[PDB]
């Protein structure tokens, strides 16, 4: 007799949660500008 | 926010960079004068996504920021 199949699954796998980092105030317009300069030719700062 | 920072660098060699001034002004002005985000959370969203797609769509990416937003706006309220 033989086996039905070879099932797969996680193995010694790890993960790190990263829920932080946000903007406000200037980000409102920053997004627009950033995109304009990012799409125009390249970033600027 | 204590220990904050606004400046970025004192390397003013390219004029294109200075444009950040006019652009930023046009943004805040259009955002304060017509705060769509305050009118409808969905409106601002659609305008953003479209504003980004309308910027890459055209090949004249070297166009005035006034056209980018202008087109992105009128396009948002297009039939």
Q: Which two tokens stand for residue B58?
A: 């055209």
Contact B51/B69 with Cβ under 8 angstroms? yes
CA proximity to B78, closest of B38, B45, B50: B50
3-class DSSP assignment, residue B9: coil
Contact A41/B61 with Cβ under 8 angstroms? yes
A27 in contact with chain B, both atoms CB, cutoff 8 A: no
B24 in contact with chain A, both atoms CB, cutoff 8 A: yes
3-class DSSP assignment, residue A6: coil
Q: How far is CA A18 from CA A3, B5, B21, B52, in A?
A: 41, 24, 34, 27
3-class DSSP assignment, residue A29: helix
B76: Cβ contacts below 8 Å, ≥ 6 apart? B43, B46, B47, B50
- Report the structure determination method: NMR
**B33, B65, B47, B78: CA torsion to nearest 10:** 100
């Amino acid at each position: 007799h033989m086996d039905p199949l070879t099932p797969d699954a996680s193995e010694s796998v790890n993960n790190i949660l990263k829920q932080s980092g946000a903007w406000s105030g200037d980000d409102k317009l920053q997004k627009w500008v950033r995109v304009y300069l990012d799409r125009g030719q390249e970033a600027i700062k | 926010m204590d220990n904050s920072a606004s400046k970025n660098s004192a390397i003013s060699s390219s004029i294109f960079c200075e444009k950040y001034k006019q652009t930023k002004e046009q943004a805040l002005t259009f955002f304060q004068e017509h705060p769509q985000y305050m009118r409808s959370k969905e409106d601002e969203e659609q305008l953003m996504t479209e504003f980004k797609k309308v910027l890459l769509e055209p090949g004249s990416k070297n166009l005035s920021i006034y056209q980018t937003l202008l087109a992105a706006h009128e396009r948002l309220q297009a039939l």
